[PDB]
Design a protein around this ligand. Structure first.
Ligand code: BOI
Ligand code: BOI
Ligand code: CA
Ligand code: CA
Ligand code: ZN
Ligand code: ZN
Ligand code: ZN
Ligand code: ZN
Lengths: 523, 523
């Protein structure tokens, strides 16, 4: 019996086709992804293969102005149009709190939404009961397939789920659900979830009864053969894990941003044992036409986005200096604004040991692409912010040792004076450079804002201590020569869209007035 | 023909009786003012004197939780109960914008509200037309008296009137209105307004046809004889000005906070010439009973205030360190919070030459009377803020030369180490002390945030430059040994209530997290 699993993960609001690097589509003849093109390919496969499941491993929420305006209604609408068979909750599905998940996604999706390791307490337990499920048994041809969900146990640090949801250890929660499915004579089981490739391999190894793991969160690209685009594979597709009971369990993921459609064919025997599996993610490039009906519906929904983009978000009473002459040479108030917005975006519920789990921000000055003039009655619109932050990136959370952060600050000024992009704007850090010193030894003072403290204050950076830092995905990936960040980081989780982080902060503040205040000094 | 003018000014929300220093009444047997006691005295005078006018010279708005909750409805209600005959607009009547004045005061007052020097433009001109008047002619016995209003031309820097109101020069605007009254055979004219004692003397001198000036704003106490309480008179009551045409024009004011009722008897001849005048403000002490009906109505309205005082205003995720061990010895995050709230409260409409007219704050650490613990789910209520700021003061705007501010910072640490109240918390200032230096020479660096700049940044304090600073009225009055502030200041305007400034800022922010960030350093 052959099952074809089609899968997406970390689509992150890429409803429209994007450029090759998942930013705004500018050269239509070379654009990729989008739900209209995904619809064409899914429909084609469903005409040819008898047993198909289309699954999403979470993180449809967050990524573009579509999510900013429609707040998940676009996810329910377009996932319903594609006829997804099941979806697991991702961390970003909690960005607008549990209410922003219940309404509109859980109440409007025409497919089960799953997570076996999220437990509710208090009145929320009654409000949400049955709106998401630990698993669903689906009929596929003349057989049934059980799909069990899971979501990152770290979601409380990576989104806004509130204090009435408990995120349990994935393996601990999954095992009893898989054993329950076995008692109900369900012999084909898919674990679909959102914890990252490392956890997916552990689930494949340790959760007895799981036949295949379909994952997400880490934006992992897996491929068997020569890669079709710029993404470098982390391993073969599927990635085979040997389970504790000796079975070979395929693990799949399909990068992010709707650029690829995962495709895995699994051959099962009559007892649900996996005989073999093969496949590869399909690059959704311009060789696949965008479905005209879906494309026309996307164009209709785009009107409200164009209208929103010109509305006032808030006001500034100061000139927002995002010039290269300032932001690539010294502390600039646009850099302070964006770092303050990044820290505000990352305020999460913590225990009594931290005021907040993260207090620090770094931002390459070359990533700030325009100033914003305050003389248009102080108005700031999304279009203005898009000129400052045009790359379509995210502001991510990483864990870096102090030694790595000291190397990053040395890199920030290693060739100072040429208007190069690596000069860092900061938040929660006070740095002093002495440019008369040799490159690599110019950082003379580096103080950081504490997190494990009830009163935030600055203390010297410690080389062996691991710090949480918010920074662009461009830097987390080693952009601008920050290879030490990519190579030495101890954890990396994708954050919210860059423009959205700043837009939300400006709207909350109503009137902003960022100052240059001594975060970066020269001796 | 004898006219008795009863007058109040700068009542500033003191609806209830207060202590002798106009703070919360604690020893009822020695409390003063309040509208219930004012009603008793006004009613008594109106039984005895045939020709009485009860006038208010503005600034009923702002000062206590009454204004915070009722937003001017309490002013219309209780001024109507007292049967005020006329009121001039004060600067604080614009604290909640022109909408917060129109509704509820202008639409609900049963007496004319006046100002001849405020002109509206755009659609507001039609919306507000006739809701306030340049003057009113009132019948008094068998005669008529014209009352012409005026309001501080500096109101755009001292409140939130918006950009659709123009505040003209008082004398320029008043003169044509007084000459118009003379054409209508009104020969007895009172100028009632809110610009301060200095401007009141200029109006008495230069506006031809004005028989008496009844003022406010500067909280001026005038008295003829031995003063009845702790207020020190600035001059006799009335203060006589010789007009340009040789007449003697009495000028009156009655301190502030409803502690006194101004009382002036004027003898006019048949042609409206002033023959003589005499009087004195009446101290509203415990020898005058509170009117039982007004007192019962005040007690009924107080219920909503008690309810509000326990509601959540916002949350803190950090411990708000308002301890004396911190705030009298070093930078404390409660001090940073309050100074940031003071600066946010003073954001006003400026020309293209300033991002804001004021950027600096000083606050005596001894004025911070409690910390606020963040472990009650982060909740902050008005009752918590009242424990931090219990004195019932205001956060005022002053103009100080840099030399005066350097002397204030030397005074801040002149006897450092004894937990004395004069140690300053700051905003928009970065100070460095070297305590090994002799007292009076411990300030080694003092940088201030620019105002006449599009990008706020810090520059060294200049001894000859005049800076605007927000600080408690306690310090503006030379409290805590800051005699140099009282003696050397170049301008002083009373600001908003201390608790209200902080409460509004916390509600706007929703979640606060003030840090200790290096505003005060020790070498
Ligand atoms: C995020 N990012 C970035 O910050 N930068 C910053 O620009 C700087 C280069 O700018 P430049 O010196 O002004 C000359 P340009 O490359 O703009 O021609 C870099 O140093 C770096 O700081 C560059 C690339 C970049 N991402 O590359 C992917 C990408 C490119 C274009 C678009 Cl529209 C969307 C995604
Ligand atoms: C505003 N203010 C103030 O900050 N202080 C600060 O307290 C300090 C004295 O406090 P302490 O060392 O704790 C001994 P205490 O006088 O509380 O017994 C002063 O140095 C100064 O910084 C003092 C008086 C004061 N205003 O005096 C008028 C007033 C007094 C009491 C009440 Cl409830 C209402 C209005
Ligand atoms: Ca099986
Ligand atoms: Ca006259
Ligand atoms: Zn994701
Ligand atoms: Zn994720
Ligand atoms: Zn006043
Ligand atoms: Zn005033």
């Amino acid at each position: 019996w052959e099952l074809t699993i089609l899968h997406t993960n970390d689509v992150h609001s890429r409803l429209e086709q994007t450029s090759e690097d998942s930013s705004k589509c500018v050269d239509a003849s070379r654009c990729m992804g989008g739900v209209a093109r995904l619809f064409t390919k899914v429909q084609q496969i469903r005409r040819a293969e008898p047993n198909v499941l289309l699954l999403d491993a979470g993180d449809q929420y967050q990524g573009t102005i579509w999510f900013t305006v429609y707040k998940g209604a676009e996810v329910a609408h377009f996932m319903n149009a594609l006829r997804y068979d099941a979806m697991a909750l991702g961390n970003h599905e909690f960005d607008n709190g549990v209410e922003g998940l219940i309404e509109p996604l859980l109440k409007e999706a025409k497919f089960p939404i799953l997570s076996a390791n999220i437990k509710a307490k208090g009145p929320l337990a009654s409000q949400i009961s049955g709106l998401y499920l630990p698993y669903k048994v689906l009929p596929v041809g003349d057989e049934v397939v059980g799909i069990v969900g899971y979501t990152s146990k770290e979601t409380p640090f990576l989104s806004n789920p509130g204090t009435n949801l408990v995120f349990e250890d994935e393996i601990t929660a999954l095992q009893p659900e898989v054993d329950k499915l076995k008692t109900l004579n369900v012999n084909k089981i898919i674990a679909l979830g959102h914890s990252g490739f490392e956890m997916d391999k552990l689930i494949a190894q340790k959760v007895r009864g799981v036949d295949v793991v379909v994952g997400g969160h880490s934006n992992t690209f897996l491929y068997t053969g020569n890669p079709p685009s710029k993404e470098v594979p982390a391993g073969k597709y599927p990635f085979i894990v040997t389970s504790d009971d000796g079975r070979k369990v395929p693990v799949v993921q399909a990068y992010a941003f709707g650029k690829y459609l995962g495709y895995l064919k699994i051959e099962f025997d009559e007892r649900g044992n996996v005989i073999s599996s093969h496949g590869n993610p399909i690059l959704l490039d311009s060789s696949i036409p965008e479905d005209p009906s879906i494309k026309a519906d996307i164009n209709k929904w785009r009107i409200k986005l164009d209208d929103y983009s010109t509305q006032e978000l808030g006001k500034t009473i100061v000139y927002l200096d995002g010039s290269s002459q300032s932001c690539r040479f010294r502390e600039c108030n646009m850099g302070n604004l964006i770092c303050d917005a990044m820290i505000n975006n990352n305020l999460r519920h913590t225990d009594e040991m931290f005021w907040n789990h993260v207090s620090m921000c770094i931002l390459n000055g070359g990533g700030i692409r325009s100033p914003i003039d305050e003389r248009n009655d102080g108005t700031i619109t999304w279009e203005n912010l898009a000129a400052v932050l045009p790359f379509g990136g995210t502001f991510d959370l990483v864990q870096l040792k102090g030694s790595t952060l000291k190397k990053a600050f040395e890199h920030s000024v290693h060739r100072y004076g040429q208007s190069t992009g690596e000069f860092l704007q900061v938040g929660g850090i006070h740095v002093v450079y002495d440019l008369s010193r040799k490159p690599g030894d110019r950082v003379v003072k580096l103080d950081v804002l504490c997190t494990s403290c009830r009163v935030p204050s600055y203390d010297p950076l410690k080389m062996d201590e691991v710090y949480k830092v918010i920074l662009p995905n461009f830097l987390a990936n080693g952009g601008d020569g920050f290879q030490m960040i990519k190579d030495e980081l101890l954890r990396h989780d994708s954050g919210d869209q860059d423009i959205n982080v700043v837009s939300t902060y400006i709207s909350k503040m109503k009137v902003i007035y960022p100052a240059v205040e001594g975060r970066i000094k020269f001796s």
